[PDB]
Design a protein that fits this description.
The structure is cut from a larger assembly and holds chains A and B. Chain A contains two helices and 30 strands. By secondary structure, chain A is mostly beta strands. Chain B is about 0% helix and about 40% strand. Chain B has no helices and four strands. Classes of the chains: A mainly beta, B mainly beta. At the A-B interface, loops of A face loops of B. Chain B: This is Structural polyprotein.
């Protein structure tokens, strides 16, 4: 038996689905989203970390000359300075006063803890949303995980549910993502082989274990100062150690829709965006036969109080006939007002009370208790408390019913003016007829 | 390892019409931030180091 619904993608909003299977007493299912996890497909572009600059002891050649050579090492710099005369602590190092050279050599390397302290630059696309849904009905009250696509059917008490494709393509991750430990950053990092000195990615590695390394740190050597053995050089400070203080706060503090961002794996939890279709197949053991249900009849509704507050600020009393005591499914057939309870005990006392939440000055929702139907009309006052620590339990439908006071005044004014206009029309038509016959 | 970090004082909330007023009493430069839970979060971020509202 197929049935379908569409629950809000709102965590902890306990949407209630009503099934009116014609052979059976109705049932209300509660479908509460316990978690969602929107996880992008990630392709790693490269790894960035702090560089190490290797500066060996200078090869000072006393009484002679030396020649530099090229080497296959990142950002490698090598120059031979002629006419050095270095002093060590005990005296001049060379006997030749000017016939000496210093070979100054330096190059960049991946730092020794880049195994442990690195930022991984990713492309993030084609996100898959998984949700944890709590299903309850009758004696069944269970939590299950389902991929939110039109495909992953999941069993609950012998029911099968398909949580159809999320009604949006939105995700908080931009196309380029930088991940670092517990954080995620929306950052248009430069391509591999294209990083610039002192900015993020001034050294780049395709993987952590890659033996190759791109480096562009603006390393330049300069001449040993007169009388000193020092290999003097200038280099732009590590763009990763700049980034680490320039990052600001991560996407976890900036994502829209209240998403909570986590790593390992990179995911956006509990985003409040869009809505989730549901396909529900329910076995005959879940329902109750109409012969066993109570014959709830002559149902009527009166509203004790209503506040259009974010909690269940309305209270109604429903009154009815019944043949037997029992349980009935109860539902509100209009999104203007959501009920708190899914089922109500029916008794020969012939009345019971039901609580609802609404966002409108005068809702005219209609409710059922078992097979019986009635319409509830409320006059709802505004809440006094400006701010609350919880989200709205209603669907935020605010337009008042046409039977409400504001729309009753609108209807009186509109029918007054239109009736006068139609009088003027009828007069003008009868005058133009008579003055045509003349 | 784990590093022990303080917890700042719970700020004095007072609620106005569509406003929360916070009084912030830091002992040391403390990050205050907020965002809207809508489609446009307009995130605010401030290192609060003075006793400020």
């Amino acid at each position: 038996y197929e049935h379908t619904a569409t629950i809000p993608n709102v965590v902890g909003f306990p949407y209630k689905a009503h099934i009116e299977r014609n052979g059976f007493s109705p049932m209300t299912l509660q479908l509460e989203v316990v978690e969602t996890s929107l996880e992008p497909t990630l392709n790693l572009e490269y790894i960035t970390c702090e560089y190490k600059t290797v500066v060996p002891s200078p090869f000072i050649k006393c009484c002679g000359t030396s020649e530099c050579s090229s080497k296959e090492q990142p950002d490698y710099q090598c120059k031979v300075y002629t006419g050095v005369y270095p002093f060590m602590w005990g005296g001049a190092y060379c006997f030749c006063d000017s016939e000496n050279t210093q070979l100054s050599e330096a190059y960049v390397d991946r730092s020794d803890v880049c195994k442990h302290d690195h930022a991984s630059a990713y492309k993030a696309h084609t996100a898959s949303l998984k949700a944890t849904i709590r299903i309850s009905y009758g004696t069944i009250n269970q939590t299950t995980e389902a991929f939110v696509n039109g495909e992953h059917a999941v069993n609950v008490g012998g029911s099968k549910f398909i949580f159809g494709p999320i009604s949006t393509a939105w995700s908080p991750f931009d196309n380029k993502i930088v991940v670092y430990k517990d954080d995620v950053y929306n950052q248009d990092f430069p391509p591999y082989g294209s990083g610039q000195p002192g900015r993020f990615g001034d050294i780049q590695s395709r993987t952590v274990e890659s033996k190759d390394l791109y480096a562009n740190t603006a390393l330049k050597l300069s001449r040993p100062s007169p009388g000193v053995v020092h290999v003097p050089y200038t280099q732009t400070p590590s763009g990763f150690k700049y980034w680490l203080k320039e990052k600001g706060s991560s996407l976890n503090t900036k994502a829209p829709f209240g998403c909570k961002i986590k790593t390992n794996p990179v995911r956006a939890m509990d985003c409040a965006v869009g809505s989730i279709p549901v396909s529900m197949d329910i076995p005959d053991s879940a329902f109750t036969r109409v012969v066993d249900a109570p014959a709830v009849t002559d149902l009527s509704c009166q509203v004790v109080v209503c506040t259009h507050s974010s909690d269940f600020g309305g209270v109604a009393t429903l009154s009815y006939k019944t043949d037997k005591p029992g349980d009935c499914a109860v539902h509100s057939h209009s999104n203007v007002a959501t009920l708190q309870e899914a089922t109500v005990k029916v008794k020969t006392a012939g009345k019971v009370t039901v609580h609802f939440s609404t966002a409108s000055a005068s809702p005219a929702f209609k409710v059922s208790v078992c097979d019986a139907k009635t319409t509830c009309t409320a006059a709802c006052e505004p809440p006094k408390d400006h701010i609350v620590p919880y989200g709205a339990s209603h669907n935020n439908q605010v337009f008042p019913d046409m039977s409400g006071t504001a729309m009753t005044w609108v209807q009186r004014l509109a029918s007054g003016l239109g009736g006068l206009a139609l009088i003027a029309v009828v007069v003008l038509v009868l005058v133009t007829c008579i003055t045509m016959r003349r | 390892v784990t590093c022990r970090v303080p917890l700042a004082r719970a700020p004095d909330v007072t609620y106005g019409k569509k406003e929360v007023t916070l009084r912030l009493h830091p002992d040391h430069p403390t990050l205050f931030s907020y965002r809207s839970l809508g489609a446009e979060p307009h995130p605010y971020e401030e290192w609060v180091d003075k006793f400020s509202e």
